[PDB]
Protein backbone atom coordinates (compact mmCIF):
# COMPACT_ATOMS: atom_id res chain seq x y z
CA UNK A 1 0.00 0.00 0.00
CA UNK A 2 1.14 3.30 1.03
CA UNK A 3 2.49 1.67 3.90
CA UNK A 4 5.34 -0.52 2.34
CA UNK A 5 6.40 3.26 0.52
CA UNK A 6 5.97 4.76 3.74
CA UNK A 7 8.06 1.99 5.71
CA UNK A 8 10.66 2.20 3.34
CA UNK A 9 10.99 5.96 3.80
CA UNK A 10 11.00 5.64 7.16
CA UNK A 11 13.66 3.22 6.88
CA UNK A 12 16.01 5.36 4.68
CA UNK A 13 15.67 8.25 7.29
CA UNK A 14 16.92 5.55 9.99
CA UNK A 15 19.86 4.65 7.42
CA UNK A 16 20.73 8.13 7.08
CA UNK A 17 20.87 9.21 10.71
CA UNK A 18 22.97 6.30 11.10
CA UNK A 19 25.11 7.00 8.62
CA UNK A 20 25.55 11.00 9.86
CA UNK A 21 26.20 9.35 13.52
CA UNK A 22 28.62 6.82 12.73
CA UNK A 23 31.03 9.52 10.74
CA UNK A 24 33.35 12.31 12.51
CA UNK A 25 33.25 14.77 9.47
CA UNK A 26 29.37 13.91 8.98
CA UNK A 27 28.78 14.88 12.69
CA UNK A 28 30.84 18.13 12.33
CA UNK A 29 28.40 19.08 9.61
CA UNK A 30 24.93 18.40 10.86
CA UNK A 31 23.67 21.36 11.65
CA UNK A 32 23.80 21.77 7.90
CA UNK A 33 21.75 18.74 6.96
CA UNK A 34 18.01 18.65 7.62
CA UNK A 35 15.83 16.16 6.76
CA UNK A 36 12.79 15.71 7.77
CA UNK A 37 8.96 13.92 5.86
CA UNK A 38 6.93 16.09 3.38
CA UNK A 39 3.86 15.82 1.38
CA UNK A 40 5.82 14.67 -1.59
CA UNK A 41 8.16 11.98 0.28
CA UNK A 42 11.66 12.25 1.89
CA UNK A 43 13.56 15.50 2.05
CA UNK A 44 17.24 16.07 2.79
CA UNK A 45 18.82 19.49 2.99
CA UNK A 46 21.90 20.69 2.83
CA UNK A 47 22.58 24.29 3.57
CA UNK A 48 25.10 26.59 2.24
CA UNK A 49 26.11 29.45 3.97
CA UNK A 50 28.59 32.56 3.95
CA UNK A 51 30.54 30.86 6.91
CA UNK A 52 29.96 27.24 5.85
CA UNK A 53 29.98 27.38 1.94
CA UNK A 54 29.02 24.04 0.10
CA UNK A 55 30.42 25.24 -3.23
CA UNK A 56 33.35 28.01 -3.99
CA UNK A 57 32.22 31.75 -4.82
CA UNK A 58 30.12 32.37 -7.63
CA UNK A 59 31.05 28.72 -8.51
CA UNK A 60 29.06 25.24 -8.88
CA UNK A 61 32.29 23.68 -8.02
CA UNK A 62 31.81 21.95 -4.90
CA UNK A 63 33.52 22.16 -1.76
CA UNK A 64 35.96 19.46 0.33
CA UNK A 65 33.09 18.61 2.57
CA UNK A 66 29.72 18.96 0.01
CA UNK A 67 31.98 16.36 -1.79
CA UNK A 68 32.13 14.50 1.55
CA UNK A 69 28.32 14.76 2.01
CA UNK A 70 26.80 13.69 -1.00
CA UNK A 71 29.41 10.58 -2.07
CA UNK A 72 28.82 9.41 1.72
CA UNK A 73 24.74 9.28 0.77
CA UNK A 74 24.79 8.38 -2.25
CA UNK A 75 25.17 4.55 -1.70
CA UNK A 76 22.73 4.29 1.24
CA UNK A 77 20.04 7.11 -1.19
CA UNK A 78 20.20 3.84 -3.64
CA UNK A 79 19.08 1.48 -1.07
CA UNK A 80 14.96 2.26 -2.10
CA UNK A 81 14.33 2.22 -5.82
CA UNK A 82 12.30 5.62 -5.19
CA UNK A 83 13.56 8.62 -7.72
CA UNK A 84 14.74 11.72 -6.38
CA UNK A 85 14.20 15.49 -7.46
CA UNK A 86 17.73 17.76 -6.50
CA UNK A 87 16.79 21.12 -6.21
CA UNK A 88 19.53 24.43 -6.04
CA UNK A 89 18.05 27.31 -4.46
CA UNK A 90 20.14 30.42 -4.33
CA UNK A 91 18.92 33.45 -3.07
CA UNK A 92 22.21 35.38 -3.01
CA UNK A 93 23.28 39.21 -3.93
CA UNK A 94 23.91 39.71 -7.79
CA UNK A 95 26.15 37.36 -9.40
CA UNK A 96 29.38 39.13 -9.91
CA UNK A 97 32.42 39.11 -12.85
CA UNK A 98 32.36 36.75 -15.70
CA UNK A 99 28.38 36.67 -16.88
CA UNK A 100 27.01 36.67 -20.62
CA UNK A 101 23.82 36.70 -18.48
CA UNK A 102 24.57 34.65 -16.19
CA UNK A 103 23.39 34.94 -12.97
CA UNK A 104 21.99 33.62 -9.84
CA UNK A 105 19.50 31.52 -11.59
CA UNK A 106 21.75 29.76 -13.93
CA UNK A 107 24.31 29.45 -11.08
CA UNK A 108 21.31 27.31 -8.96
CA UNK A 109 20.93 24.96 -11.69
CA UNK A 110 24.17 24.74 -12.19
CA UNK A 111 24.86 23.33 -8.36
CA UNK A 112 21.75 21.20 -9.02
CA UNK A 113 23.83 19.66 -11.41
CA UNK A 114 27.08 19.73 -10.09
CA UNK A 115 25.27 18.20 -7.28
CA UNK A 116 23.67 15.21 -9.44
CA UNK A 117 27.12 14.24 -10.62
CA UNK A 118 28.43 13.84 -7.10
CA UNK A 119 25.67 11.70 -6.10
CA UNK A 120 26.28 9.52 -9.67
CA UNK A 121 30.48 9.56 -8.66
CA UNK A 122 29.32 8.53 -5.31
CA UNK A 123 27.45 5.54 -6.50
CA UNK A 124 24.09 6.65 -7.04
CA UNK A 125 22.08 4.83 -9.99
CA UNK A 126 21.62 6.82 -13.20
CA UNK A 127 18.24 6.96 -13.95
CA UNK A 128 17.63 7.61 -10.06
CA UNK A 129 17.25 11.66 -10.43
CA UNK A 130 14.33 12.12 -12.65
CA UNK A 131 14.65 16.10 -12.65
CA UNK A 132 16.99 19.33 -11.36
CA UNK A 133 15.75 22.29 -10.19
CA UNK A 134 16.87 25.99 -10.20
CA UNK A 135 15.56 28.70 -7.78
CA UNK A 136 16.73 32.05 -7.15
CA UNK A 137 15.34 34.69 -5.69
CA UNK A 138 16.15 38.88 -7.14
CA UNK A 139 20.77 38.96 6.29
CA UNK A 140 18.83 37.24 3.80
CA UNK A 141 20.99 35.35 2.00
CA UNK A 142 19.54 31.59 1.67
CA UNK A 143 21.47 29.18 -0.19
CA UNK A 144 20.60 25.70 -0.11
CA UNK A 145 20.54 22.19 -2.03
CA UNK A 146 17.52 20.12 -1.74
CA UNK A 147 17.48 16.34 -2.31
CA UNK A 148 13.47 14.63 -2.18
CA UNK A 149 13.34 11.47 -2.45
CA UNK A 150 9.51 11.22 -4.16
CA UNK A 151 7.17 8.97 -2.99
CA UNK A 152 5.09 7.13 -5.59
CA UNK A 153 2.56 9.69 -5.77
CA UNK A 154 5.01 12.44 -6.41
CA UNK A 155 6.81 11.19 -8.85
CA UNK A 156 3.78 9.98 -10.91
CA UNK A 157 2.43 13.45 -10.88
CA UNK A 158 5.63 14.81 -12.15
CA UNK A 159 5.87 12.64 -15.16
CA UNK A 160 2.28 13.16 -16.09
CA UNK A 161 3.14 17.39 -15.96
CA UNK A 162 6.03 16.34 -17.97
CA UNK A 163 4.70 13.93 -20.58
CA UNK A 164 3.93 15.89 -24.17
CA UNK A 165 0.15 13.94 -23.64
CA UNK A 166 -2.90 14.95 -22.01
CA UNK B 1 -12.76 31.89 -6.01
CA UNK B 2 -10.49 29.26 -8.33
CA UNK B 3 -12.99 30.86 -10.60
CA UNK B 4 -11.59 34.43 -11.73
CA UNK B 5 -8.08 32.23 -11.68
CA UNK B 6 -9.75 29.83 -14.29
CA UNK B 7 -11.45 32.59 -16.12
CA UNK B 8 -8.07 34.71 -16.25
CA UNK B 9 -6.22 31.37 -17.15
CA UNK B 10 -8.72 30.72 -20.22
CA UNK B 11 -8.49 34.71 -21.18
CA UNK B 12 -4.76 33.77 -21.48
CA UNK B 13 -5.11 30.89 -23.29
CA UNK B 14 -7.13 32.44 -25.78
CA UNK B 15 -4.59 35.83 -25.95
CA UNK B 16 -1.98 33.36 -26.38
CA UNK B 17 -4.31 32.02 -29.71
CA UNK B 18 -5.19 35.75 -30.98
CA UNK B 19 -1.43 36.06 -30.97
CA UNK B 20 -0.32 32.89 -32.49
CA UNK B 21 -2.83 33.38 -35.51
CA UNK B 22 -1.86 36.69 -36.12
CA UNK B 23 1.54 36.06 -36.56
CA UNK B 24 3.11 34.93 -40.15
CA UNK B 25 5.92 33.73 -38.33
CA UNK B 26 4.43 32.17 -35.50
CA UNK B 27 1.61 30.75 -37.85
CA UNK B 28 4.16 28.70 -39.63
CA UNK B 29 5.20 27.37 -36.57
CA UNK B 30 2.45 26.65 -35.10
CA UNK B 31 2.82 22.09 -34.89
CA UNK B 32 5.94 23.14 -32.86
CA UNK B 33 3.62 24.92 -30.30
CA UNK B 34 0.94 23.28 -27.88
CA UNK B 35 -1.29 24.79 -25.32
CA UNK B 36 -3.46 23.23 -23.01
CA UNK B 37 -4.89 22.88 -19.33
CA UNK B 38 -3.44 20.65 -17.11
CA UNK B 39 -3.64 20.04 -13.05
CA UNK B 40 -0.96 22.68 -11.97
CA UNK B 41 -2.28 25.66 -14.60
CA UNK B 42 -1.79 26.45 -18.11
CA UNK B 43 0.84 24.68 -19.99
CA UNK B 44 2.96 25.78 -23.35
CA UNK B 45 4.88 23.44 -24.98
CA UNK B 46 7.46 24.22 -27.72
CA UNK B 47 8.73 21.10 -29.51
CA UNK B 48 12.45 21.34 -30.08
CA UNK B 49 12.98 18.26 -32.85
CA UNK B 50 15.94 17.38 -35.63
CA UNK B 51 13.91 18.93 -38.70
CA UNK B 52 13.25 22.45 -36.64
CA UNK B 53 15.57 22.82 -33.51
CA UNK B 54 14.77 25.64 -30.93
CA UNK B 55 18.47 25.07 -30.26
CA UNK B 56 21.82 25.22 -32.20
CA UNK B 57 23.51 21.81 -31.97
CA UNK B 58 24.89 20.61 -28.12
CA UNK B 59 24.19 24.66 -27.40
CA UNK B 60 21.77 26.31 -25.10
CA UNK B 61 22.12 28.98 -27.48
CA UNK B 62 18.47 29.81 -28.90
CA UNK B 63 17.71 29.28 -32.65
CA UNK B 64 16.46 32.66 -35.01
CA UNK B 65 12.77 31.16 -34.70
CA UNK B 66 12.75 29.95 -30.80
CA UNK B 67 14.04 33.87 -30.07
CA UNK B 68 10.63 34.86 -32.12
CA UNK B 69 8.49 32.53 -30.36
CA UNK B 70 9.31 33.33 -26.51
CA UNK B 71 9.38 37.22 -27.56
CA UNK B 72 6.34 37.26 -28.98
CA UNK B 73 5.06 35.68 -25.88
CA UNK B 74 6.89 37.35 -23.22
CA UNK B 75 4.21 40.30 -23.10
CA UNK B 76 0.85 38.25 -23.41
CA UNK B 77 2.30 36.27 -20.31
CA UNK B 78 2.78 39.76 -18.55
CA UNK B 79 -1.07 40.09 -18.59
CA UNK B 80 -1.41 38.24 -15.51
CA UNK B 81 0.14 37.86 -12.17
CA UNK B 82 0.41 33.98 -12.14
CA UNK B 83 3.83 32.73 -11.86
CA UNK B 84 5.80 30.32 -14.10
CA UNK B 85 7.40 27.59 -14.04
CA UNK B 86 10.40 27.03 -16.77
CA UNK B 87 11.25 23.17 -17.94
CA UNK B 88 13.66 21.63 -20.65
CA UNK B 89 13.16 18.49 -21.23
CA UNK B 90 16.28 16.78 -23.06
CA UNK B 91 16.00 13.07 -23.96
CA UNK B 92 18.73 12.47 -27.12
CA UNK B 93 22.17 10.97 -27.60
CA UNK B 94 24.86 11.48 -25.64
CA UNK B 95 26.16 14.73 -25.71
CA UNK B 96 29.33 14.97 -27.45
CA UNK B 97 32.42 16.60 -28.10
CA UNK B 98 33.04 19.37 -24.70
CA UNK B 99 32.26 18.20 -21.55
CA UNK B 100 33.96 18.43 -18.28
CA UNK B 101 30.49 15.96 -16.89
CA UNK B 102 28.62 18.36 -19.07
CA UNK B 103 25.75 16.07 -20.48
CA UNK B 104 22.04 16.42 -21.12
CA UNK B 105 20.95 17.19 -17.84
CA UNK B 106 23.53 19.93 -18.04
CA UNK B 107 22.23 21.13 -21.64
CA UNK B 108 18.73 20.54 -20.56
CA UNK B 109 18.69 23.34 -17.50
CA UNK B 110 20.89 25.46 -19.56
CA UNK B 111 18.29 25.99 -22.44
CA UNK B 112 16.00 26.30 -19.59
CA UNK B 113 17.78 29.19 -18.41
CA UNK B 114 18.33 30.38 -21.81
CA UNK B 115 14.84 30.09 -22.42
CA UNK B 116 14.08 32.38 -19.19
CA UNK B 117 16.15 35.30 -20.21
CA UNK B 118 14.72 35.43 -23.88
CA UNK B 119 11.59 35.72 -22.28
CA UNK B 120 12.84 38.69 -19.58
CA UNK B 121 14.48 40.12 -23.21
CA UNK B 122 11.04 39.93 -24.12
CA UNK B 123 9.52 41.98 -21.55
CA UNK B 124 8.55 39.57 -18.86
CA UNK B 125 8.82 40.82 -15.43
CA UNK B 126 11.60 39.45 -13.72
CA UNK B 127 9.87 36.96 -10.49
CA UNK B 128 7.56 35.64 -12.97
CA UNK B 129 9.39 32.63 -13.17
CA UNK B 130 9.69 30.82 -10.16
CA UNK B 131 11.52 28.06 -11.18
CA UNK B 132 13.74 26.34 -14.14
CA UNK B 133 13.80 22.45 -14.33
CA UNK B 134 15.78 20.57 -16.13
CA UNK B 135 15.23 16.66 -17.13
CA UNK B 136 17.06 14.59 -19.38
CA UNK B 137 16.60 10.57 -19.42
CA UNK B 138 19.68 8.04 -20.48
CA UNK B 139 12.81 7.82 -33.71
CA UNK B 140 12.97 8.37 -29.26
CA UNK B 141 14.28 11.66 -29.66
CA UNK B 142 12.00 13.88 -27.22
CA UNK B 143 13.35 17.26 -26.66
CA UNK B 144 10.92 20.62 -25.92
CA UNK B 145 10.80 23.74 -23.44
CA UNK B 146 7.37 23.39 -21.60
CA UNK B 147 6.36 27.16 -19.63
CA UNK B 148 3.49 25.93 -17.08
CA UNK B 149 1.63 29.07 -16.11
CA UNK B 150 0.93 27.93 -12.15
CA UNK B 151 -2.11 28.42 -10.58
CA UNK B 152 -2.19 29.82 -7.05
CA UNK B 153 -2.43 26.40 -5.97
CA UNK B 154 0.04 24.88 -7.46
CA UNK B 155 2.11 27.61 -6.86
CA UNK B 156 1.89 27.59 -2.95
CA UNK B 157 2.61 23.87 -3.10
CA UNK B 158 5.78 24.60 -4.90
CA UNK B 159 6.38 27.13 -1.97
CA UNK B 160 5.64 25.07 0.59
CA UNK B 161 8.10 21.88 -0.89
CA UNK B 162 10.89 24.47 -0.97
CA UNK B 163 11.16 26.38 1.99
CA UNK B 164 13.34 25.44 4.87
CA UNK B 165 10.45 25.58 7.75
CA UNK B 166 7.97 22.67 8.70
Given at each position: ????????????????????????KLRALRPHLKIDLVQEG???????????????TG???????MRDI??????????????????????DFPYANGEKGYSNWELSA???????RELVAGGL????????????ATDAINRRISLLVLNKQAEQAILHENAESQ
Amino acid sequence: KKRMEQSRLNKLRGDLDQLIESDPKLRALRPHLKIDLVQEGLRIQIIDSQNRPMFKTGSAEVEPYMRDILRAIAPVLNGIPNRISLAGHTDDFPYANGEKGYSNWELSADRANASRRELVAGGLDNGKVLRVVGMAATDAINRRISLLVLNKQAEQAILHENAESQ
